[PDB]
């Protein structure tokens, strides 16, 4: 009963694998060789913010690029206003470990997970004056990695036990569950027109998911370790991956395989956060030695380096308007690059 | 209109700065252990003496939150980088089927060479010594080495207690302490202890520690150690 | 695709010989610490030996220390097990197992709960 169907998996594999390899007409970076560099992309550190703790693990921008989101371990959620450096709300959480945190859209809902198994949605709009808990999610036996406002009322959610959720917060039940992966799941990242989004999990493999239907479409495994970051490209029909393999994958919706590799001899660091920029010529990686890499997402290059940090960048953050870039480390600063 | 905004931020985050100056005072001064132990110990014996729980206790005015890891998968290498900021990971081992001393030895291997956990001290008992008590009459065949090994002479006994048991003690300690002595490198240290099954002084013996490693913190600013 | 074939195996009587071979396909095998962990009928996963990238520092488990003999080949990135004065009670489901990061010295591989970086495994009974 095994063998007929592994042996039938691994032909399937290998069809999949004949497939993207007959589609192989050329590589990206064969074609990409009469294009303009983007020379040296030298960015100023205009901000710093310091109010948080302990470390700051995670933080989101929101959609009008005015107010951001930043979760420390210390307990407390701070929102900061990125001209004035004004600390806006502080909120005092029931439990210490945040291992994600979410604006929504409208700026009506931070969402917030750790450790605990508990998702807490705060509404801002308290009439009364303080915040408050609106409501809370307990559907999960791992541990909260990432969360993402769809909109107001539906909210994705990631977890450690191999499984992917959506909620439904006026209710508070489970809409659908996602059982794709085999490892612990660490981000997901939503496309711009809110439809499809990819799951990056701890098998080396990215799960592209059907929203409204409830099931995966394509699994691409070109990474050789754990799958950390994943961000959409602004079109939404391609997205890029870093693992902890030390080496930037760029995978295509369409072409069903990667297009271009990123990697450098004299790094051999860990990747924590990736993220693109408003026109996609320039790809933000936070690795694990201590700066964040500018790399040409079109030629395999280092624009430019943000050594700023004194510690291990946790988080990067890009405005949906290009106007800033916000980094949050383990050093418990805040750094806006121009 | 664009001064009473630039005046009501103002007063925001004063009242915000204030509120977090009066909570650094507590973040600072309270101590965090974190309870790392296998199934097969009582973890939760030593609890009473949602995914994660929490015990809240003081002892000589000093506040200690210890953290249960509970119903968590078994996959730690993700989840265990967000504990580099604890004072103290309390690691209990059962001196007891497969060999989970082995295990015990691997995990404890993989936790004290994990690169983003090496400015952490460890703080390690040995639970069920009447267990090895109970097993001198009823261990030798899974370690050959328990025969080529003599009982150290600085290390005195207990009296009532049999020698052979001693011996197994002081040989499983000896198996941690290789470990810890060559890829410690200084920066950190490793303190082993002995408990029972039922005892009441290792909540003291905890405070014993995690005074000293505060001091060789302070020791390591200094340059003096 | 990473993807791990263990090779070689069957049944053999106690005191005689047998070799491994671990087939590493999809990824930089010689950045890789890697290990030999075994499941015995009844009993949870146990660690049995290991070797890093360079192949210096071995270590086995206290019962098989100095019975069997680890040989990793970075030339065909082959990992080979040699298995010497075989006995009745050593008979296990063996897996040929990854550790998940690149250069480093601590691995987690204990997982039973389908942990996704170890092969499908082989089976040698005595």
């Known amino acids: 009963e095994l063998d007929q169907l592994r042996q039938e998996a691994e032909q399937l594999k290998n069809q999949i694998r004949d497939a993207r390899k007959a589609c192989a007409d050329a590589t990206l970076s064969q074609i990409t060789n009469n294009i303009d560099p983007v020379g040296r992309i030298q960015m100023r550190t205009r901000r710093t913010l310091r109010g948080h703790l302990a470390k700051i693990y995670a933080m989101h921008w929101g959609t009008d690029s005015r107010l951001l989101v930043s979760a420390s371990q210390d307990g407390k959620l701070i929102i900061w206003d990125s001209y004035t450096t004004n600390k806006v709300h502080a909120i005092p959480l029931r439990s210490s470990w945040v291992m994600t945190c979410a604006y929504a859209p409208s700026g009506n809902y931070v969402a917030c997970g750790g450790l605990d198994n508990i998702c807490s949605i705060y509404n801002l709009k308290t009439r009364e004056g303080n915040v408050r808990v609106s409501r809370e999610l307990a559907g999960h036996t791992g541990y909260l990695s990432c969360c993402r406002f769809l909109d107001d009322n539906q909210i994705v959610t990631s977890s450690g036990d191999t499984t992917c959720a959506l909620w439904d917060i006026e209710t508070g039940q489970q809409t659908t569950t996602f059982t794709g992966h085999t490892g612990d799941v660490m981000s997901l990242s939503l496309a711009p027109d809110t439809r499809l989004f990819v799951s990056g999990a701890c098998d080396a493999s990215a799960k592209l998911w059907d929203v409204r239907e409830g099931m995966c479409r394509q699994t691409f495994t070109g990474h050789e370790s754990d799958i950390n970051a994943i961000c959409f490209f602004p079109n939404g029909n391609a997205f890029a991956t870093g693992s902890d393999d030390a080496t930037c994958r760029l995978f295509d919706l369409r072409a069903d395989q990667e297009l271009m590799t990123y990697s450098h001899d004299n790094i051999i660091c860990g990747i924590t956060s990736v993220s693109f920029s408003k026109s996609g010529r320039l790809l933000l990686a936070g690795y694990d030695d201590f700066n964040c890499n500018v790399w040409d997402a079109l030629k395999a290059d280092r624009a430019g380096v943000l050594a700023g940090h004194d510690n291990r960048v946790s988080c990067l953050g890009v405005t949906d308007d290009g106007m800033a870039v916000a980094t949050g480390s383990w050093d418990s600063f805040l750094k806006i690059w121009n | 209109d664009q001064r009473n905004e630039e005046k009501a931020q103002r007063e925001a985050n004063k009242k915000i700065e204030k509120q977090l100056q009066k909570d650094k005072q507590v973040y600072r001064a309270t101590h965090r252990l974190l309870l790392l132990g296998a199934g097969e110990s009582g973890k939760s014996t030593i609890v009473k003496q949602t995914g994660i729980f929490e015990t809240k206790f003081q002892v000589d005015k000093v506040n200690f939150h210890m953290f249960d890891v509970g119903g968590q998968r078994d996959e730690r290498r993700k989840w265990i980088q967000c504990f580099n900021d604890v004072t103290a990971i309390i690691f209990v081992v059962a001196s007891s089927q497969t060999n989970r001393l082995q295990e015990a030895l691997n995990l404890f291997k993989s936790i004290w060479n994990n690169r983003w956990l090496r400015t952490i001290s460890v703080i390690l008992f040995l639970n069920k010594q009447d267990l090895l008590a109970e097993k001198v009459l009823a261990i030798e065949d899974y370690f050959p080495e328990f025969a080529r090994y003599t009982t150290p002479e600085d290390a005195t006994p207990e009296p009532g207690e049999d020698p052979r048991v001693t011996r197994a003690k002081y040989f499983i300690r000896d198996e941690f302490l290789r470990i810890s002595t060559a890829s410690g490198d200084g920066r950190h240290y490793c303190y082993p202890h002995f408990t029972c099954a039922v005892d009441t002084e290792n909540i003291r013996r905890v405070f014993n520690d995690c005074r000293d490693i505060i001091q060789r913190m302070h020791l390591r600013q200094y340059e003096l150690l | 695709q990473v993807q791990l074939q263990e090779s070689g195996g069957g049944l053999v009587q106690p005191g005689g010989s047998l070799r491994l071979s671990c087939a590493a396909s999809?990824?930089?095998?010689?950045?890789?610490?890697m290990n030999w962990v075994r499941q015995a009928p009844g009993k949870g996963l146990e660690w049995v030996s290991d070797?890093?990238?360079?192949?210096?520092?071995?270590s086995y488990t206290g019962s098989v220390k100095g019975r069997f003999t680890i040989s990793r080949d970075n030339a065909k990135n082959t990992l080979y097990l040699q298995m010497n004065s075989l006995k009745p009670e050593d008979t296990a489901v063996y897996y040929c197992?990854?550790?998940?990061?690149?250069?480093?010295?601590?691995?987690?591989?204990?997982?039973?709960?389908?942990?996704?970086?170890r092969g499908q495994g082989t089976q040698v009974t005595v």
């Open positions: 070797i890093s990238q360079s192949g210096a520092s071995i």
């Open positions: 999809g990824f930089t095998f010689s950045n890789y610490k």
């Open positions: 197992a990854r550790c998940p990061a690149p250069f480093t010295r601590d691995c987690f591989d204990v997982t039973s709960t389908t942990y996704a970086y």
